[PDB]
Motif scaffolding. Structure first.
Motif, PDB file in Angstrom:
ATOM      1  N   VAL A   1      -1.458  -6.526   1.241  1.00 35.30           N
ATOM      2  CA  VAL A   1      -2.806  -7.010   0.978  1.00 35.30           C
ATOM      3  C   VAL A   1      -2.765  -7.825  -0.317  1.00 35.30           C
ATOM      4  CG1 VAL A   1      -5.226  -6.312   0.767  1.00 35.30           C
ATOM      5  CG2 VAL A   1      -3.620  -4.811   1.956  1.00 35.30           C
ATOM      6  N   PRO A   2      -3.335  -9.031  -0.291  1.00 39.35           N
ATOM      7  CA  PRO A   2      -3.449  -9.857  -1.503  1.00 39.35           C
ATOM      8  C   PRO A   2      -4.340  -9.192  -2.559  1.00 39.35           C
ATOM      9  CG  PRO A   2      -3.949 -11.120   0.464  1.00 39.35           C
ATOM     10  CD  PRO A   2      -3.918  -9.691   0.890  1.00 39.35           C
ATOM     11  N   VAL A   3      -4.034  -9.431  -3.837  1.00 43.87           N
ATOM     12  CA  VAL A   3      -4.830  -8.944  -4.961  1.00 43.87           C
ATOM     13  C   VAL A   3      -6.303  -9.359  -4.815  1.00 43.87           C
ATOM     14  CG1 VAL A   3      -5.271  -9.377  -7.443  1.00 43.87           C
ATOM     15  CG2 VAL A   3      -3.023  -8.605  -6.681  1.00 43.87           C
ATOM     16  N   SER A   4      -6.529 -10.587  -4.349  1.00 39.67           N
ATOM     17  CA  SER A   4      -7.878 -11.121  -4.183  1.00 39.67           C
ATOM     18  C   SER A   4      -8.790 -10.232  -3.353  1.00 39.67           C
ATOM     19  CB  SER A   4      -7.836 -12.514  -3.562  1.00 39.67           C
ATOM     20  OG  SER A   4      -7.247 -12.460  -2.280  1.00 39.67           O
ATOM     21  N   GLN A   5      -8.226  -9.516  -2.388  1.00 43.08           N
ATOM     22  CA  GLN A   5      -9.013  -8.651  -1.535  1.00 43.08           C
ATOM     23  C   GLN A   5      -9.243  -7.257  -2.111  1.00 43.08           C
ATOM     24  OE1 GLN A   5      -8.866  -8.714   2.844  1.00 43.08           O
ATOM     25  NE2 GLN A   5      -7.422 -10.411   2.611  1.00 43.08           N
ATOM     26  N   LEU A   6      -8.195  -6.656  -2.677  1.00 42.66           N
ATOM     27  CA  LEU A   6      -8.274  -5.316  -3.278  1.00 42.66           C
ATOM     28  C   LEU A   6      -9.275  -5.199  -4.422  1.00 42.66           C
ATOM     29  CD1 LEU A   6      -4.468  -4.549  -3.548  1.00 42.66           C
ATOM     30  CD2 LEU A   6      -6.021  -3.722  -1.787  1.00 42.66           C
TER      31      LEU A   6
ATOM     32  N   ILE B   1       0.816  -1.217   0.000  1.00 42.13           N
ATOM     33  CA  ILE B   1       0.000   0.000   0.000  1.00 42.13           C
ATOM     34  C   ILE B   1       0.858   1.280   0.000  1.00 42.13           C
ATOM     35  CG2 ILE B   1      -1.922   1.222   1.145  1.00 42.13           C
ATOM     36  CD1 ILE B   1      -2.670  -1.602  -0.057  1.00 42.13           C
ATOM     37  N   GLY B   2       0.753   2.067  -1.067  1.00 46.45           N
ATOM     38  CA  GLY B   2       1.526   3.296  -1.206  1.00 46.45           C
ATOM     39  C   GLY B   2       0.816   4.505  -0.623  1.00 46.45           C
ATOM     40  N   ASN B   3       1.497   5.660  -0.611  1.00 43.34           N
ATOM     41  CA  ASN B   3       0.942   6.907  -0.045  1.00 43.34           C
ATOM     42  C   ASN B   3      -0.065   7.541  -0.995  1.00 43.34           C
ATOM     43  OD1 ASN B   3       2.690   7.301   2.539  1.00 43.34           O
ATOM     44  ND2 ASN B   3       4.190   6.946   0.903  1.00 43.34           N
ATOM     45  N   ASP B   4      -0.039   7.029  -2.221  1.00 44.84           N
ATOM     46  CA  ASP B   4      -1.079   7.211  -3.219  1.00 44.84           C
ATOM     47  C   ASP B   4      -2.461   6.854  -2.672  1.00 44.84           C
ATOM     48  OD1 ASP B   4      -0.045   8.298  -5.517  1.00 44.84           O
ATOM     49  OD2 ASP B   4      -0.244   6.546  -6.764  1.00 44.84           O
ATOM     50  N   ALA B   5      -2.596   5.599  -2.234  1.00 41.88           N
ATOM     51  CA  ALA B   5      -3.834   5.044  -1.690  1.00 41.88           C
ATOM     52  C   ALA B   5      -4.325   5.816  -0.466  1.00 41.88           C
ATOM     53  CB  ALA B   5      -3.642   3.572  -1.351  1.00 41.88           C
TER      54      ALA B   5
ATOM     55  N   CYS C   1      -8.528   0.641  -4.837  1.00 41.49           N
ATOM     56  CA  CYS C   1      -8.659   0.938  -6.246  1.00 41.49           C
ATOM     57  C   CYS C   1      -7.391   1.579  -6.824  1.00 41.49           C
ATOM     58  CB  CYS C   1      -9.833   1.894  -6.352  1.00 41.49           C
ATOM     59  SG  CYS C   1     -10.492   2.078  -7.974  1.00 41.49           S
ATOM     60  N   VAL C   2      -6.919   2.619  -6.155  1.00 44.18           N
ATOM     61  CA  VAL C   2      -5.688   3.303  -6.516  1.00 44.18           C
ATOM     62  C   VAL C   2      -4.455   2.403  -6.363  1.00 44.18           C
ATOM     63  CG1 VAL C   2      -4.112   5.089  -5.644  1.00 44.18           C
ATOM     64  CG2 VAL C   2      -6.490   5.685  -6.256  1.00 44.18           C
ATOM     65  N   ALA C   3      -4.383   1.625  -5.283  1.00 43.97           N
ATOM     66  CA  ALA C   3      -3.239   0.740  -5.070  1.00 43.97           C
ATOM     67  C   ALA C   3      -3.129  -0.320  -6.163  1.00 43.97           C
ATOM     68  CB  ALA C   3      -3.298   0.096  -3.709  1.00 43.97           C
TER      69      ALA C   3
ATOM     70  N   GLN D   1      -1.162   5.852 -11.654  1.00 42.97           N
ATOM     71  CA  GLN D   1      -2.566   6.146 -11.910  1.00 42.97           C
ATOM     72  C   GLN D   1      -2.790   6.657 -13.321  1.00 42.97           C
ATOM     73  OE1 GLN D   1      -5.319   7.842  -8.716  1.00 42.97           O
ATOM     74  NE2 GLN D   1      -3.305   8.377  -7.849  1.00 42.97           N
ATOM     75  N   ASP D   2      -1.949   7.592 -13.744  1.00 39.62           N
ATOM     76  CA  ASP D   2      -2.057   8.222 -15.061  1.00 39.62           C
ATOM     77  C   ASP D   2      -1.929   7.208 -16.196  1.00 39.62           C
ATOM     78  OD1 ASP D   2      -2.488  10.782 -13.847  1.00 39.62           O
ATOM     79  OD2 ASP D   2      -0.396  11.283 -13.803  1.00 39.62           O
ATOM     80  N   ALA D   3      -0.985   6.284 -16.068  1.00 39.30           N
ATOM     81  CA  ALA D   3      -0.844   5.248 -17.083  1.00 39.30           C
ATOM     82  C   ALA D   3      -2.042   4.268 -17.107  1.00 39.30           C
ATOM     83  CB  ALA D   3       0.471   4.520 -16.932  1.00 39.30           C
ATOM     84  N   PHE D   4      -2.631   3.994 -15.937  1.00 38.91           N
ATOM     85  CA  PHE D   4      -3.834   3.165 -15.872  1.00 38.91           C
ATOM     86  C   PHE D   4      -5.033   3.836 -16.565  1.00 38.91           C
ATOM     87  CE2 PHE D   4      -7.266   0.593 -14.392  1.00 38.91           C
ATOM     88  CZ  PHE D   4      -6.729  -0.631 -14.034  1.00 38.91           C
ATOM     89  N   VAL D   5      -5.233   5.125 -16.305  1.00 40.87           N
ATOM     90  CA  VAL D   5      -6.256   5.911 -16.997  1.00 40.87           C
ATOM     91  C   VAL D   5      -6.005   5.912 -18.508  1.00 40.87           C
ATOM     92  CG1 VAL D   5      -7.261   8.242 -17.257  1.00 40.87           C
ATOM     93  CG2 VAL D   5      -6.831   7.305 -14.985  1.00 40.87           C
ATOM     94  N   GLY D   6      -4.736   6.014 -18.888  1.00 42.67           N
ATOM     95  CA  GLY D   6      -4.358   5.823 -20.275  1.00 42.67           C
ATOM     96  C   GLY D   6      -4.919   4.524 -20.834  1.00 42.67           C
ATOM     97  N   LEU D   7      -4.752   3.404 -20.118  1.00 44.22           N
ATOM     98  CA  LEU D   7      -5.305   2.108 -20.566  1.00 44.22           C
ATOM     99  C   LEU D   7      -6.835   2.106 -20.606  1.00 44.22           C
ATOM    100  CD1 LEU D   7      -3.207  -0.534 -18.593  1.00 44.22           C
ATOM    101  CD2 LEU D   7      -3.046  -0.049 -21.042  1.00 44.22           C
ATOM    102  N   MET D   8      -7.460   2.712 -19.600  1.00 44.40           N
ATOM    103  CA  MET D   8      -8.915   2.832 -19.545  1.00 44.40           C
ATOM    104  C   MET D   8      -9.439   3.510 -20.806  1.00 44.40           C
ATOM    105  SD  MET D   8      -9.463   3.922 -15.566  1.00 44.40           S
ATOM    106  CE  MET D   8     -11.302   4.151 -15.591  1.00 44.40           C
TER     107      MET D   8
END
Ligand code: HG
Length: 347
Positions: free
Chosen positions: A89-94, A69-73, A107-109, A118-125
């Motif tokens: 935290v496991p991926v299964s829970q997030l 968990i980063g300071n992003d989250a 969501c952010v993590a 985050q910006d690159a993920f929005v790029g994919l979205m």
């Protein structure tokens, strides 16, 4: 006569915009302001989910992998709901954050984990928005909180629901989980329609903010028939689930979805001149799904015409050589390309 050919009235729906589509045929059964740009709010997470499911289908990470968990989250202390920075935290829970009211830190993590930032993920979205051909959608964030520059529409949100069920079935199945663990704690799915016993609802996503109103994308099955509805800018708490229930119920009552022709099945057989064989095997290269008025299955007629008067070799596999016409009361309701199913080389 007139009871056979009747066009049903559409019920009163207490929302700014809505659409009802059949999942298999893509047919629009009812719509109102379906293309008007509106703030989707947390329905944003539907696209987020899509990208995450694409990642997991491509084998980039798994259910059992650990995320830091980063300071992003944290940047979006006495509540057990929030993820503590630097915890594992496991991926299964997030990825269950989709079923929650909030869960935006998860969501952010996950966005950072999958795409680096985050910006690159929005790029994919937004690339996936284009790949699906959506005309009235654009995103700014993974969660839809902080950016009422983002927009979608009922139609586009329905088409995202469709792509979720079609492209990433394993991710889609997360949506029907009634109870699940999030952060070591037992949580309940926000989609109340999951508990309705009159329908088999298994999705998708519910949301509410004061600007956007009540929004729901739902999907239900009855037999081999699947409907998707999107209801956006719903006006009252009372109608948050009832309005969509009304839409889905209506579509099942007045329409059915039929599958008259499957890919690779011989629809017809025709003489071939100058070939290895004297017989062409003809069908379709894509399954045929038609949505028709319920109870009209047996008045449905299929026939075909060829592009020419004879078929000469050579004929390639999946070569278009004619047209299949589908008919209800001598009206053509659908046409498909008629293809050759087996290579026929020259004699
Ligand atoms: Hg998310």
């Amino acid at each position: 006569l007139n009871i056979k050919t009747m066009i049903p009235g559409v019920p009163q729906i207490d929302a700014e915009s809505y659409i009802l589509i059949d999942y298999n045929s893509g047919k629009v059964l009812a719509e109102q302001n379906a293309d008007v740009r509106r703030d989707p709010a947390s329905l944003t997470k539907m696209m987020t989910s899509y990208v995450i499911g694409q990642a997991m289908k491509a084998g980039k990470f798994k259910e059992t992998d650990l995320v830091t968990i980063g300071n992003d989250a944290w940047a979006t202390g006495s509540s057990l709901m929030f993820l503590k920075p630097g915890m594992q935290v496991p991926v299964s829970q997030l990825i269950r954050d989709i079923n929650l009211q909030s869960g935006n830190d998860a969501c952010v993590a996950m966005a950072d984990f999958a795409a680096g930032s985050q910006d690159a993920f929005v790029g994919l979205m937004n690339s996936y928005v284009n790949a699906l051909g959506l005309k009235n959608t654009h995103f700014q964030t993974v969660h839809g909180l902080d950016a009422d520059g983002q927009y979608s529409s009922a139609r586009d949100m329905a088409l995202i629901g469709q792509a979720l069920i079609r492209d990433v079935p394993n991710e889609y199945s997360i949506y029907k989980e009634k109870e699940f663990t999030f952060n070591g704690i037992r949580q309940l799915n926000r989609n109340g329609l999951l508990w309705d016993n009159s329908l088999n609802v298994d999705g998708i996503k519910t949301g509410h903010t004061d600007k956007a109103g009540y929004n729901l994308v739902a999907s239900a099955t009855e037999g081999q028939m699947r409907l998707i509805s999107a209801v956006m800018g719903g006006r009252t708490f009372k109608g948050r689930e009832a309005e969509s229930k009304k839409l889905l119920t209506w579509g099942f009552r007045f329409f059915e979805t039929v599958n008259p022709l499957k890919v690779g099945k011989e629809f017809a057989s025709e003489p071939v001149w100058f070939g290895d064989s004297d017989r062409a095997s003809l069908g379709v290269d894509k399954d045929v799904y038609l949505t028709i008025p319920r109870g009209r299955m047996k008045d449905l007629k299929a026939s075909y015409v060829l592009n020419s008067s004879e078929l000469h070799a050579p004929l390639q596999k999946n070569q278009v050589v004619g047209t299949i016409n589908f008919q209800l009361d001598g009206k053509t309701i659908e046409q498909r390309p008629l293809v050759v199913l087996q290579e026929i080389p020259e004699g």
